Amino acid sequence: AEGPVTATKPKEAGFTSEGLARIDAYLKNEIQAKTMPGAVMMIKRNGETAYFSSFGLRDPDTKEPMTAETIFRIYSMSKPITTVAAMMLVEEGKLQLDEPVSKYIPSFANVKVGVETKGENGMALETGPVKRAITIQDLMRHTSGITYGFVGDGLVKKAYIASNLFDGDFDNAEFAERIAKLPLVYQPGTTWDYGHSTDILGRVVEVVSGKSLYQFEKERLLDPLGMKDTGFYVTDPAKKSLVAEAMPNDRKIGGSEMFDPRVQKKWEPGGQGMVSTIGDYARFTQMVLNGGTLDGKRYLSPKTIAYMGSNHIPQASGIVPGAYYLPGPGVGFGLGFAVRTEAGVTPVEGSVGDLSWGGAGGTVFWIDPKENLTVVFMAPMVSPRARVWRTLRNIVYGAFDRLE
Predict the structure, then answer these.
(1) Which of 11, 214, 291, 329 is buried most deeply by CB count within 10 Å?
(2) Could you give the dihedral angle defined by the CA atoms of residues 65, 254, 129 and 316, in that order, rounded to the nearest 10 degrees?
(3) Beta carbons of 231 and 275 less than 8 angstroms apart
(4) How far does CA 84 lie from the centroid of its chain?
């Protein structure tokens, strides 16, 4: 419990009051069940705030309250931000989608692809050349052969884990070199597989701009949008106590405790590193919903936004799903967004063309152009995150009084 953060206009937003009350009841029940210590959620539709409420605690140990100003590790919700940054360089003609990553990070020129095969002592890796160079587009839509060691299983993934990629205090340049030493899981430009591509893309942004990923983003996006609590580390002493923490039994991601964003380090990974607030991220998603503009400032053209929100892995692309196609049936993938392709099929409510992604620490968003809708939700949690996110989709769409 705690409730509304601001005034709302649910009827002009095309919802019922009864419908939106289902969100309150669901979230209060989940907090009671210890799914999360607390939660904050914002719904924007037809240019109005339909819903903006805070419940429970931001940290179950300190018992500090959940607030709009609470700062979350957003993990993979870093990726749309990184991709937008890269597309700004594309619009300026400083970066191209068909270019090889090796143009900017030469160590990717001679990466090899690992294939599992039987040896004398069980399965082992054979390695061979890439048929095509990894492209910038490949990074943006996760068809590069670059993977995550901790997602699923496989010999290349085991090699990632064995290389201890996250040891020490290193920067985006050093991380890119670590990744380039590993075999690829698939031939570049053939297969969708989620991974460290966006961390590599972040380094490309640095090479092109001559700035750190954060400084580039700060100047071009975060400052002008008013995302004043978005970055990679919480360095302001006044804001360190605002970091959301999960229930004690649900604080591990990738087998390790969540990183402490209050202690600044060199790494600024565009795939996983960011911290933000619900208000900051909603400004970002409203800007995207608006076709690249907010409060009279343009960040990307509406054509660029439409292009990012298009399916870049339909059958016509030649791309196939890998062993771990996270979006599932009826959902494709664009430049940093899952893109719904079927009205039914996917087992959650939504609209063809809706755009979404989430973070391993419990944060999620979606953007629904058809319904003039964006939703951001943040609660610190890991294990139950997917079922909560899916349920929230069903409740939000179930609360509609009309279609746009």
Answers:
(1) 214
(2) -50
(3) yes
(4) 12
Structure tokens at 66: 């959940």
Q: What is the CATH number of the domain that holds 286?
A: 3.40.710.10
Q: How was this structure determined?
A: X-ray
**Residue 209 in contact with residue 89, Cβ under 8 Å?**
yes
Tokens of 76: 């993979």
Q: To 10 degrees, the CA torsion angle through 160, 164, 165, 168?
A: 180
**Domain span at 228:** 1-404
Please check whether residue 133 is in contact with residue 101, taking contact to mean a CB–CB distance below 8 angstroms. Answer: yes
What is the helix (H) or strand (E) element at residue 26, kind and residue range? helix 17-32
| 391/26 Cα distance (integer angstroms) | 9
User: How far apart (Å, rounded) are the C-alpha atoms in residues 372 and 183?
Assistant: 43
State the sign of the Cα–Cα–Cα–Cα dihedral 182, 139, 359, 223. positive
Resolution of this model in Å is 1.8
CB 392, CB 30: distance < 8 Å: no
- Which amino acid appears at position 41 of this protein? M
What's the total number of domains in the chain?
1
Radius of gyration of the CA atoms of the chain, in A: 21
